[PDB]
């Protein structure tokens with residue numbers, strides 16, 4: 200029952216994560232995708248919250264956000280077809296490299312900043328930023344996933360205090376910045392209570408390989424008082440961020456909802472019995488059905504060249 204409708208559009212390959220994640224092939228275009236499979240019965244009470252997260256993803260379209268292509272709902276399952284990221288997790292990348300240089304950290308950090316600033320510009324907050332939530336695509340560009348961990352959580356978030364998601368994101372970004380340049384967490388312990396004490400105290404070791412500017416940026420992000428944390432606006436053109444670039448982080452989306460690609464509308468129209476204008480009208484509704492999937496995948500096929 201569960202897989203019948205999905206199997207009309209996708210050829211399923213192997214599981215890569217357990218929500219379960221499967222690699223698949225889009226039949227029409229031949230494009231690889233990742234399929235997030237969610238058991239509705241397993242979620243039960245947390246199900247309406249997963250539905251609000253899907254709706255938020257429908258409103259996020261960005262070069263550094265893993266793209267939603269298709270949402271399929273059955274009696275027992277929710278399927279989310281997503282952008283294929285074969286480079287894997289930034290978590291695995293950090294471990295394989297041990298730690299990144301200041302220069303390579305900047306390449307990756309400016310991409311995280313671009314995604315997160317855009318998420319905030321859309322009225323959302325991520326709240327679970329960590330290197331397991333950042334994937335590399337075939338072009339080695341980062342893609343943010345799993346919208347909506349203890350080692351990355353802001354002191355106020357752990358204490359159960361009221362918080363602004365934007366300030367909790369800036370703290371988690373400070374933790375990511377440290378891990379990128381150090382290869383280990385600033386706050387860590389085998390005991391959960393001792394880790395909780397360490398986060399709230401906000402004291403961490405400053406390794407010898409960190410430059411004075413890196414150290415100052417970490418201080419500006421890793422403030423226990425959320426009001427003392429740097430705002431996203433000042434992070435876009437921060438002196439550490441501008442070093443070797445001399446231009447602020449481009450956070451604005453390059454992936455439109457409005458403008459449609461004429462080649463992709465043309466390619467798409469041959470598979471349907473409608474005229475071009477009807478086709479453009481249908482695509483513009485952005486229903487996250489097979490039509491949305493096909494259009495976005497043709498665009499991804501085109502960008503490859």
Ligand SMILES: Fc1ccccc1-n1cc(-c2ccncc2OCC2CCNCC2)cn1
Pocket residue numbers: 215216217220222232233235265281282283284285286287288334344345
């Ligand atoms: F990760 C990959 C490796 C090789 C080929 C493709 C991928 N890929 C994963 C996704 C993906 C997209 C949206 N949400 C979750 C996703 O994966 C979660 C798993 C959890 C276990 N670790 C690996 C990533 C997209 N492409």
